[PDB]
Amino acid sequence: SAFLKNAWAKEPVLVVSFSVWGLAIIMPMISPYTKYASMINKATPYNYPVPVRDDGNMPDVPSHPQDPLGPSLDWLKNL
């Protein structure tokens, strides 16, 4: 601890340097948003979404984009 103190006052870059190294190694682990990154980027639609044939055996897939079925990004909205 004592050295820590002097280190804070002598060679006070490394201290800050390491501190950041860690804080970046922690915040991701503990945060209410970390999960969003993999989603927000997942959602971003870059490649055309090819439509599947309607065997008529699928109640999950929305038959029309504006239908009340399917995925939503309201999480992205009001984020």
Partner 1 sequence: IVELPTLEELKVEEVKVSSAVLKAAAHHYGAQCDKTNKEFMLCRWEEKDPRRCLKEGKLVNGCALNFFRQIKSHCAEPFTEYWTCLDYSNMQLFRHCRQQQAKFDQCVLDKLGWVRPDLGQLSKVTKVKTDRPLPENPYHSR
Partner 2 sequence: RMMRWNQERRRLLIEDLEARIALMPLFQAEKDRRTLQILRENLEEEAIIMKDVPNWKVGESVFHTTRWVPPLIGEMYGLRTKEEMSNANFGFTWYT
Partner 3 sequence: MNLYTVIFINILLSLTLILVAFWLPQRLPFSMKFFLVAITFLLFDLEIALLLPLPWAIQTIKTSTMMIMAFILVTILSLGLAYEWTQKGLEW
Ligand X SMILES: CCCCCCCCCCCCCCCCCC(=O)OC[C@H](COP(=O)(O)OCCN)OC(=O)CCCCCCCCCCCCCCCCC
Q: Which residues would be at the binding site for partner 2 (CB under 8 A)?
A: 33, 40, 43-46, 48-49, 73, 76-77, 79
CA distance 24 to 18: 10
CA distance 65 to 79: 22
Asked whether position 71 contacts partner 1 by CB under 8 A, the answer is: yes
The residue count for the chain:
79
Asked whether position 5 contacts partner 3 by CB under 8 A, the answer is: no
Residues in binding contact with partner 1, number by CB under 8 A: 25
The first and second tokens of residue 1, run together, are 């601890």
Q: Which of residues 6-45 bind partner 3 (CB under 8 A)?
A: 21, 24-25, 28, 37-38, 41-42, 44
